[PDB]
Amino acid sequence: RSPFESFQWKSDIFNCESTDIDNFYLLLEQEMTRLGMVEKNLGEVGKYKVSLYQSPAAKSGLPSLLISAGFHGEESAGPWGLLHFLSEASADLFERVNLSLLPLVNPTGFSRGHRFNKYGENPNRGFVFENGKPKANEHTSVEGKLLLDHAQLLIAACRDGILTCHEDVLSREAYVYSFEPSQVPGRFSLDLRDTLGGYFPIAVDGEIDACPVKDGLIFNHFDTSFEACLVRSGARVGACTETPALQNFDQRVLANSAAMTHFLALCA
Ligand SMILES: [Zn+2]
Numbered sequence: 411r412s413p414f415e416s417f418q419w420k421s422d423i424f425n426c427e428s429t430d431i432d433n434f435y436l437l438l439e440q441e442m443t444r445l446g447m448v449e450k451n452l453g454e455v456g457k458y459k460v461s462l463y464q465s466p467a468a469k470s471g472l473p474s475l476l477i478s479a480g481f482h483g484e485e486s487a488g489p490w491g492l493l494h495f496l497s498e499a500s501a502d503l504f505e506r507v508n509l510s511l512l513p514l515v516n517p518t519g520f521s522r523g524h525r526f527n528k529y530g531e532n533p534n535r536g537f538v539f540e541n542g543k544p545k546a547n548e549h550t551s552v553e554g555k556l557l558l559d560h561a562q563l564l565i566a567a568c569r570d571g572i573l574t575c576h577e578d579v580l581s582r583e584a585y586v587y588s589f590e591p592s593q594v595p596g597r598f599s600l601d602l603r604d605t606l607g608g609y610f611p612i613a614v615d616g617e618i619d620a621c622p623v624k625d626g627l628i629f630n631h632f633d634t635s636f637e638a639c640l641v642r643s644g645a646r647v648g649a650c651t652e653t654p655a656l657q658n659f660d661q662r663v664l665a666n667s668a669a670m671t672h673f674l675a676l677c678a
Contacts, residue, residue, distance in 0.1 A: 416523040417484040419659035428486040441496040453556040458517035468508035473570035478512035481534035483519020485577030491666025510567035537639035571677040579655040585613035589648035609665040
């Protein structure tokens with residue numbers, strides 16, 4: 411499917427269109443302000459800021475975990491899923507974890523309902539790991555460059571876990587890419603897979619790219635994506651969940667919220 415094809419859904423959970431970025435930010439601000447989270451602006455893309463939000467007064471006894479969403483503008487259940495999750499959270503959460511968020515990496519694609527940003531770039535690629543260091547290549551987008559410029563901040567934010575919430579518009583079946591320092595998947599991988607399995611049928615088999623999925627899982631597959639790069643940079647575990655964008659939008663929002671919840675429980 412074309413990376414400029416526009417996808418839009420109605421959510422009765424939020425009573426709005428999935429591309430309603432103005433409403434998205436209004437609720438995001440309210441939830442961030444209620445939680446006491448600190449904004450760290452990384453830069454701008456087409457008039458929108460791309461910001462990292464962080465829980466205040468991080469403690470070294472707690473794990474530092476990063477949840478990111480909205481690298482691809484048509485995968486809007488990720489960002490709205492994050493809003494859902496936050497609406498159900500209290501500042502008490504920050505006693506269990508040092509949470510950092512990238513709630514919407516690709517705002518220009520998100521307001522248009524399409525995968526690429528409005529400049530025809532793919533914000534989720536071009537993160538190469540060379541000479542023991544994260545680096546850009548010719549595919550790194552404006553957003554990726556902003557993320558790479560803050561590589562040290564982001565590695566620190568996700569040393570104990572990186573979850574990125576994606577969606578697959580070509581799929582009716584859920585699946586998850588995971589990274590664990592093991593030849594075989596463990597509870598981390600299997601629990602996320604099962605959480606999605608509670609909302610959707612699972613990608614029992616096939617291949618996404620040259621990558622085989624078995625029982626909803628793609629394990630330790632390294633590419634030039636933000637997640638793989640951060641895991642190579644030192645993120646102890648990583649997961650990129652894929653909810654199926656051919657299913658009901660609010661189910662995806664709830665699935666994305668459940669996965670974030672489970673991710674935090676598994677890593678805390
Ligand atoms: Zn994606």
